[PDB]
Structures are given as C-alpha cells and as structure tokens.
Design a protein around this ligand. Structure first.
Ligand SMILES: NC(=O)c1ccc[n+]([C@@H]2O[C@H](COP(=O)([O-])OP(=O)(O)OC[C@H]3O[C@@H](n4cnc5c(N)ncnc54)[C@H](O)[C@@H]3O)[C@@H](O)[C@H]2O)c1
Ligand SMILES: NC(=O)c1ccc[n+]([C@@H]2O[C@H](COP(=O)([O-])OP(=O)(O)OC[C@H]3O[C@@H](n4cnc5c(N)ncnc54)[C@H](O)[C@@H]3O)[C@@H](O)[C@H]2O)c1
Ligand SMILES: NC(=O)c1ccc[n+]([C@@H]2O[C@H](COP(=O)([O-])OP(=O)(O)OC[C@H]3O[C@@H](n4cnc5c(N)ncnc54)[C@H](O)[C@@H]3O)[C@@H](O)[C@H]2O)c1
Ligand SMILES: NC(=O)c1ccc[n+]([C@@H]2O[C@H](COP(=O)([O-])OP(=O)(O)OC[C@H]3O[C@@H](n4cnc5c(N)ncnc54)[C@H](O)[C@@H]3O)[C@@H](O)[C@H]2O)c1
Ligand SMILES: CCc1cc(O)c(Oc2ccccc2[N+](=O)[O-])cc1F
Ligand SMILES: CCc1cc(O)c(Oc2ccccc2[N+](=O)[O-])cc1F
Ligand SMILES: CCc1cc(O)c(Oc2ccccc2[N+](=O)[O-])cc1F
Ligand SMILES: CCc1cc(O)c(Oc2ccccc2[N+](=O)[O-])cc1F
Lengths: 261, 261, 261, 261
C-alpha cells in the first residue's frame, strides 16, 4: 500500500484493544515494516507475540521514565535498521488521584511531574534520541485528546499534560522540519482501552459522544489507525504541526442540550 | 487504491494548475470514477478534455450563482450515476477590489454578497442539492485558506467568506452525519493558480511561507490532492467537521521575526 | 468613571432586556455620552424614551439593510458630535426557517444572504461609514455567539454569519489600527432577549449553560455590559482583534456528560 | 475605583519594569489593598520598598519550587487578611538552554521538569494553597504568551509550559467555579522586562510586533495592568476560563509578508 518500504517503530502496544494495535494493523496492511517497544521484562513475552502477528521480530524495552532505556532503544534498533521512517508515540500515565474527582484535590507536585514527564516530555525526548537514525522524510505521530483544548470531567492533570504534548508537536515540527521530518498528532475520541479504565466516567463520556457527535457513533482503533498510516505516509507530506481530530467530529459541536427530551 | 468503486464529482477544475486538478489526479490514482463541472459553455471543450485524461466523459455545467444549474447538475448526474460518493468543492470568487488593498476601501454590500454567495453559500447549497443521490458513506470536501483564521493582507473579504465556509463545514457535518455522510475542509497553503492571480502580494506570501513554514517548502496540488483522496476515502471514516491544514505547517508558527539578518 | 468624555453610539436597543440596554447602562455609569439608533419610524417613540433615561436626546433611524440610512445616520450624528469614540454593533437577523430545525432544510440563497447581510456585513459597513468622524482612539464593539466556533442546534445559518462577523473583527482591526482605532467582539452566553425567541431550544440551551458552565450560572446584560464598557475604554487600549467570551466560561468546557445521574 | 475593598496578592514583582508592577499600579489606582511575594531573603529589602510605594507593608517570601513556602505564605497572609479577593500569578522560569536556539538541542528531562514546575504547576498549586481563605467572588490571574498557541523561535520549552498553564486555567475555572471563584489569563505581548533577557531575539520579536500588529505599536505594563485590574474586578464577573490577548492584536494576524519592500 502507501507505506511500502517504510520502517516504523510503535510504542504503547499493550493489548489487542490498544490504539497502537490499530495503528500497527493499518501500517502493516499498507506495507510498513514494524518494530515495537514494551515496558518491563514481564511484558516481553506478550509483545514478542504481537510483533510476530505483524511479521516482526524486533522488540525493545522502553520505560520512558528512564533516559538509559531511551538511548538504548535506538542503539539497539540501529543494529537492525539503518534508518527509521516512522515513530508512533501512543503512551502516557497519570496517578489515579490526578485523573479522578476534582482537579485540585488530586493535584500534587509529584502527580503533576509524573503526568507531564511520561505523557508529554517523552515524545520530543524520543524524537531527539531517534534523530540520528531518522530519515529525511520521517514522520512522527503522537496521540492526544480533546481534554487538552477544553475542560473534561476527571481528565484533569492529563489535560494539562496533553496541551503541552500538543505544543511539543508544533516546536518539534519547526525543529525537525528543515531536515524534512514531519510531526503531527491525532486527537482521538474515547475508545475502550486499558488506559481508559483510569477515567471513571469513561462510559458516560463514551455514551455522550455516541449520542452527540455529528456521526452519531464512536471511533475505532481501525479508524484512528487508518489516519495514523496516512499521517505517517508520503500522502501526508504537505502536513506537519497538525493536531488532527479523529472523533467523529465530536470536538466541533456543542452537544447534549436536549432537555430530558 | 483506497477509493476503488467511489464515484466522485469535482468542481473547480479550470486549468492543469488548479487545486481540483491535483485532487482529481490523486482520486483517479486511487481508483475513483470521476465527473466534472464547468462554468459557461465556452469552457465545455477544455473540461471535456480534462475529464478524458481522467478516463471520464461525464461533464456538467454549473455556475453556482444559478439555482437552476445546481438542480440540473444533479438531475443530469443522476441519469449516469445511481449514487454519489464524493463531492469536491474547490471554487470561489470575489470582485477585484474586495481582495486588493485596504479591507474597507474595497468593501461594498454587493462585493460582500457575491463573495459569500459564490465562495461560502455554494458549498452547503451543493450539498443540499446532492443529498437525494448521496450514499450513506459519502464524503464532501471543500477548500479553505488560513485567511479565515487570521488576517492576511489583501485577502480581505475572502477571509470573511472562508470563515463562513469553515462554519458551514461544521453545520453540514451535524446535518448530514446521522445519515453517515462526512464533511471536511482542507486549509491549503499558497499555490500558484489562476485564482491566485487575484491576490496581489501572492508572490510575497508564497516566498514568506517557503521561508518560514516548518518544512521550509511550499505545498503542491499533489500534496493537497493526496489529502483530498484521504478525506474522501473510508480511511477517513472517523473524521468529520474537520478543517485540515495542508500548508507545510505554516499555520502553526509565527514566522519572519528574523531582523534583516 | 473610566469612560468620561467618550461619545458612544449604540445600535440594537430594542427593549429593556436587550444586550445593548445593558451595555448602554454600563457606559452611562462610567461617564459616557450616548446616542442610539432605531429601526422604523414606528419605534421612534420607544427609543427616544430609552435615550432619555440615559440622559440623551440623540436618536437616529438605521435599518442596516439600507445604504442610504447608514450614510444618513453619520451625516446626522456629525451635526451633533464632532467626533465619535465608540460604536456598539448589537444587531442581527435571520429568517425563521434559517434558525429552526435542520441546517439544510432551512437553507436557501436568500436566507443565507439576508442573514450575512444584516448580522455580519453591517458591522464593517457601519465602521466604514463612521470612519471620517471616528477619533483616533475610537473603539468598535460587536456581539457574537459560541455558535460561530462550534455547531449549536438550531443556530444554523447564524453560526455561519457569526463566523464571518468574527473574521470582520480581525480585518477591521488591521484596516483601522494604523489610525489607532480598536475593534473587538464579545461572545456572549445565552440571555433571554427578544431575538432569543427565534431560537427554539433557547430555554434548553439556557438550562444547559446554567448547569454546565464553570460558574454554574448564566450571564446578564450587566455582565456583558461591564465588559462592553471595558473594551470601549482606554483600559482596553492594548486589546484589539479580540473575541472575548462573556459566558461564565461555558465555551471552555465539555459539559453535560453526566449520565442520567 | 472598581476594585475598592478588594484584597489582592501579587507575585512576580521583581523590578519597576515587571508586568506585576503594572498590574499592581492599576489595582492600587482602582482601590485595591495589595500584598506581595518575593524570592529569597536577599530581595526582601527591594520588595518591602515596592510594597511601601503602593501603601502596603504585607510582604511574604515565596519560592514556588518549595511546598513549605507555598503553605507558609497563606498561613502568614491569613494572620493579616481574613479573606483573599485576588491572586496574580506573574512568575516563571526555564534554564537558559531551554529557551535558546533549537528546541531539541536544549531539551532535557530536567529542563522540561523545572520549566513546567515553576511556570505552570505553581499556578494551580498557589490556587489550591489559597483556597481556604479565598472569598467566593475571588479572581485569579496568570500571565501567558502567544508561544503557547504557535511556535515562536527560541521560546521553545516555555511554549510547552505555557500551553499547560493555559489548560490549568480551564480546569481551575471548573474546579473553583461552583464556589464562585473565577480564573483567567492574559496572553501579553512582548515587553522589555528582566525575564525578557532570557529570550535572545526578543528585540527582533519586539520590532516585528511593533511593525506588524494591527495597532502598529507594542503594549505596556500599564495596558496589561488595566486588563489585569478588569479581570480581577466584578466588572469581569461573567468572565472565566478565558485567555485574553493584550498584544495590540498581534495574535490575530499573519504579519511581515512584505518582501524587502
Ligand atoms: N483510549 C482513549 O479514549 C484515548 C483517547 C485519546 C487519546 N488517547 C491516548 O492514546 C494513547 C494510548 O492509550 P490507549 O488508549 O491506547 O490505552 P493503552 O493502555 O492501551 O495504551 C497505554 C500505553 O501507555 C503505556 N505506558 C504507560 N506508562 C509508560 C512508560 N513509563 N513508558 C512507556 N510506555 C508507557 C502503556 O504501556 C500502554 O501501552 C495515550 O496517549 C492516550 O492518552 C486515548
Ligand atoms: N491557490 C491557493 O493558494 C489557495 C489556497 C487555499 C485555498 N484555495 C482555495 O481552493 C479553491 C480553488 O482555487 P484554485 O487555487 O484551485 O484556483 P482556480 O482558479 O484554479 O480554481 C478556481 C475555481 O473557481 C471557479 N469558480 C469561480 N466562480 C465560479 C462560479 N460562479 N461557479 C462555479 N465555479 C466558479 C473557477 O471556475 C475555478 O475552477 C478555492 O476555494 C480557493 O479559495 C486556494
Ligand atoms: N441574547 C443572546 O443569547 C445572545 C448571545 C450571544 C450574542 N447575541 C447577539 O447580541 C446581539 C443583540 O441581540 P439581543 O440578544 O440583544 O436581542 P435583541 O432583540 O434585543 O436585539 C436585536 C436587535 O437586532 C436589531 N435588528 C434586527 N434587524 C435589524 C436591521 N435590519 N437593522 C438594524 N437593526 C436590526 C433589532 O432592532 C434589535 O435591536 C445580536 O447580534 C445577537 O446575535 C445574543
Ligand atoms: N515580558 C514579556 O514579554 C511577557 C510576555 C507574555 C507573558 N509574560 C509572562 O509574564 C510573567 C512575568 O514575567 P515578566 O515579563 O514580568 O518578567 P519579570 O522578570 O519581571 O518577572 C519574572 C518573575 O518570575 C519570578 N520567578 C522566577 N522564578 C520564581 C520562583 N521559583 N518562585 C517565584 N517566582 C519566581 C521572578 O521573581 C520574577 O518576579 C511571566 O509568566 C512571563 O512568562 C511575559
Ligand atoms: C477519555 C479519553 C481518554 C483519553 C486518554 O488520554 C486516555 O489515556 C490515558 C488516560 C489516563 C492516563 C493515561 C492515559 N494514557 O494512556 O496516556 C484514555 C481515555 F479514555
Ligand atoms: C493566498 C492564498 C489563496 C487563497 C485563495 O482562497 C485563493 O483562491 C481565491 C482567491 C481570491 C478569490 C477567489 C478565490 N477562489 O478560487 O476561491 C487563492 C490564493 F492564492
Ligand atoms: C442562543 C444564543 C443566541 C445567539 C444570538 O446571536 C441571538 O441573537 C439572534 C438570534 C437569531 C437571529 C438574530 C439574532 N440577533 O439578534 O442577531 C440570540 C440568542 F439567544
Ligand atoms: C517573548 C515574550 C516573553 C514571554 C515570556 O513568557 C517571558 O517571560 C519568561 C521568559 C523566559 C523564561 C521565563 C519567563 N517568565 O518570567 O515566566 C518573557 C518574554 F519576553
């Protein structure tokens, strides 16, 4: 397909319901060669299997809290791939209390720190670490959420982190653009994933979106994935510094103002 | 490719440098069946040829100033196509003085009217007229410009018109979304086209973008086209009500603040 | 107060519940000298009284559909005021069907035209007509609504018109800024006014905002008015081309995603 | 004036050119009672003097890196003021290399951390710490910059930090709004201040803004201050979760596309 020959590294493939699984599946379909990261030796087995069902045996540990692992990841990858065409950043984290209840109740310096460190800093950090082996027409993708633009209940500290994440997309696009590398994000709609379990009221959000988005339907990892593959391909070569919504248009409306119909 | 079987109507193919030419070329490449509109019997010959080099003999007059022609277009098309999968709105107009010099000097009620009528109203108007023969997973595309979001010199009345155009994308996405039809826009960067001749300082804008966009390069009708084809395809089924920038990221920076280096 | 000596013309004072009434009241309070417009000889009596309770006897007919009345308004005003410090644009209109039910059902070329003509074009048109007697530090205010930014049910064609209105703010700010005149808008929240009667589901919107805005309360013409007076004063001299929300922060959240609590 | 009786705490008054100095001066003028913070015992003398020229003897150390000082600040203030009506957050920091040259060259985990910790986290942290003594109609103000919205040369890591700062405004507005407290920001234009010295190319930016903003002029701490006082007053009671530009409209244009005139 439109990603033949492209070599792409995917982070954040945790289960068969992960957004990164859908992106991987679309990229593979379009002819990319894939490689994967995992967090912690315990998960090496599960990820090696995932990579195998995508025709890949390239897996590398990367806890983004750890500078050593970030540098090692790309030293390791470089032994297998001379150059890297795509990077998918599809990871994040915030302590329970930082994404539950009131925004201030759950706010601490450490909660703020961790959330921004893992969910925002890790993207340009991965970009920097990958730069030497990035090809000139490389493309970097990250995943964001509407909670960066507007206040969403329980999203809280992540919203702050995502807004910084979206800003890093713009600074990264400038910093890497002379060379030719593009940098974008997808602002995905609610998808039932493992991470989604940390958002109490996710089911409520999910229902609301289904009811109120222009398409009257929620998105899938296939849809987010197909847009992933697009942004990562040369079809999207005129596109950088862009936060693309894949949320059935939910971002663009003001919904739920029917009154107990 | 990813538009096999899709039947798509393109407006605004005036020359081999038109944005609509690039979109057509990408769609054809991806396996779409195409049909075209032209303005005025004089141009029937030139467009019939364009359609022929895309493997199509379906051409239909449509001056969007004229309700009769809008209704006739889709009565005519319906005799050849049972259903319509894609509509490309790539047209517009504003009187010379409305896009030259000071915004107020060139402002008149008629200039305002014409500009909005042709450049903004015609999109949902085409959408409405096409609705009966639109398939459920149809996709409608229009072209906008950064002048809708921020004041650009000489763009003037068009900026107002484009902002209304971008709003119509959102209302159209809601209005047609229950049925399943998606509605989006591409905010394209400066491209040397016939319409571009109406913008004095286009060459200056073109230079500035090349110099200051993250990618340090201007876009092409191929790049805008590839993103067209994407939005029009099922790869973009999670995407509606979206204004997608295809401008090498220019929208996202504040450029040219080097001082006589 | 902070508008002493300022001479300000207000449009759109229809009743004691009009947004323009609140703006007038705040400006008067802050020491402005006021003048008013009315639509149609029938309403001359009601407006002359309103002006009297603001200490003013300056009233002038202005149907913004009519170029003659726009030019006459400022010829007339010029006989009483040597110079103009403030202009409040607080007017608009769209045919019933254009702001009811589905966006496409109510869409016609004439409905589009009228809506944009009265609600959007009239602002820069008033600005142009007023320019000769505008003082260098003059300030122009218009009123918009969140329906310009995001699709709101029933708002429909007005949303398109408001988006053009908000764009005209930016082009006007550039066009009049060298001279020193500022141009801004207030994106007001839902307020029970005569115009509000044209929006079926206004009560529903009103309830939703009260329930879901950060302040858990709706705004008043006093609040919109106080922000009016601010923007019109020299306190706001660093501010132009700005769309300021006065809506208890409603614009900035994603509300109502509680599920049948 | 319009802040009589209000008791307001100001952070970030470092010199007579600080933005916080201008805000203080406007608030005092409008009848507020003021109190100030300073960083480090060395600066106690300079700030005690500043407070004295505003009729205040209330000064309190607060290095926002330090949880102990944040809690102590409001224990101390509470001994003098029963309740707090206003808080001005006008502080920040990023290591030299984090705001110089390329965005990636200067990027480190620690640089990211410090920048976000001091420039973004400290605002809601101050809000939380102040909450018990905040009155119901209290108002909190922070200062941001256009670098949060679009990539600006050399702004780099601060841009990320400011975007998180602006998001915290929205989450804080929701979290504190039921009680009635408002939370806003001013996105100020370039002003020659001590902090400005950390931005090489500040003079270039300053020149560009003067040349290209709609008002053809830069802003002052008086202008930012007057808008401060506004947001902090009951005139702005309909306004929360708002990022208000005070930058002569620079944000709203695309400037400098004249070509070597
Ligand atoms: N699911 C949604 O509704 C939704 C919507 C919009 C955006 N997103 C975003 O998409 C991305 C993926 O999340 P998801 O929905 O696929 O759920 P997920 O749980 O499947 O993926 C989360 C990933 O975060 C990774 N991760 C956590 N801490 C890490 C660390 N220290 N180092 C490396 N990786 C770490 C996990 O390993 C996991 O793969 C996230 O950035 C998330 O914010 C999700
Ligand atoms: N070229 C650029 O720099 C640029 C950038 C962003 C957006 N756009 C937009 O892309 C679209 C296409 O313009 P272009 O750049 O391809 O130049 P173009 O001249 O090739 O296309 C303009 C089209 O407008 C059509 N048109 C004018 N009046 C019409 C009417 N009454 N009825 C039907 N069609 C009419 C013309 O026939 C022509 O096909 C426009 O909407 C334009 O605003 C252009
Ligand atoms: N009330 C709300 O909820 C709300 C919210 C946001 C914005 N707005 C806007 O505020 C402005 C004022 O409306 P309102 O709420 O005060 O209701 P309103 O009915 O009191 O004011 C409407 C005004 O429109 C004027 N008008 C209509 N046609 C006109 C014409 N051809 N020429 C001159 N004037 C004409 C009317 O005379 C009337 O004064 C409008 O622009 C409206 O869109 C209202
Ligand atoms: N000057 C500009 O061009 C401009 C433009 C937009 C926004 N801003 C913002 O306005 C705010 C004020 O900066 P400024 O322009 O007045 O310059 P400034 O140097 O006068 O103010 C900076 C302040 O940061 C304070 N600060 C630094 N580290 C601190 C810490 N650990 N704890 C407490 N305070 C600390 C300093 O004490 C100083 O008062 C900043 O947030 C800045 O980002 C400035
Ligand atoms: C409500 C939408 C949503 C957004 C996320 O960023 C998301 O992913 C996370 C949520 C909380 C903490 C960390 C993550 N994450 O994987 O980045 C899950 C979701 F369901
Ligand atoms: C500066 C970028 C630009 C934007 C357009 O919308 C554009 O197209 C038009 C310009 C003026 C009037 C009408 C059109 N148009 O074809 O819609 C051409 C351009 F060069
Ligand atoms: C839902 C909020 C709202 C917005 C308006 O612009 C408004 O004013 C109008 C509504 C429809 C047509 C015309 C106007 N108007 O006075 O401009 C009334 C409202 F209640
Ligand atoms: C270019 C405009 C500008 C923005 C700032 O946030 C600014 O303030 C800082 C700049 C760098 C680091 C820290 C600060 N700060 O005081 O928050 C100074 C500026 F000149």
């Amino acid at each position: 397909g439109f990603l033949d020959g492209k070599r792409i590294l995917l982070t954040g493939l945790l289960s068969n319901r992960s957004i990164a699984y859908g992106i991987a599946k679309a990229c593979k379909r379009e002819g990319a060669e894939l490689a994967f990261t995992y967090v912690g030796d315990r998960f090496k087995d599960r990820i090696t299997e995932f990579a195998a069902e995508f025709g890949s045996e390239l897996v590398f540990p990367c806890d983004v809290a750890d500078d050593a692992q970030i540098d090692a990841l790309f030293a390791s990858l470089k032994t297998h791939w001379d150059s890297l065409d795509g990077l998918v950043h599809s990871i994040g984290f915030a302590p329970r209390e930082a994404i539950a209840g009131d925004f201030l109740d759950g706010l601490t310096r450490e909660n703020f720190r961790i959330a921004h460190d893992i969910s925002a800093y890790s993207f340009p950090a991965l970009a920097k670490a990958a730069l030497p082996m990035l090809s000139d027409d490389a493309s970097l993708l990250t995943l964001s959420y509407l909670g960066a633009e507007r206040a969403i209940p329980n999203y809280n500290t992540m919203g702050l982190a995502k807004a910084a994440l979206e800003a890093s997309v713009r600074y990264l696009a400038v910093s890497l653009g002379a060379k030719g590398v593009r940098v974008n994000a997808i602002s995905a709609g609610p998808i039932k994933t493992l991470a989604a379990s940390g958002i109490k009221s996710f089911g409520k959000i999910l229902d609301f979106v289904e009811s109120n988005s222009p398409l009257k339907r929620n998105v899938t990892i296939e849809q987010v994935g197909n847009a992933g593959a697009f942004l990562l391909s040369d079809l999207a070569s005129g596109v950088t510094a862009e936060v693309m919504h894949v949320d059935s248009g939910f971002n663009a409306v003001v919904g739920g103002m029917a009154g107990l119909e």
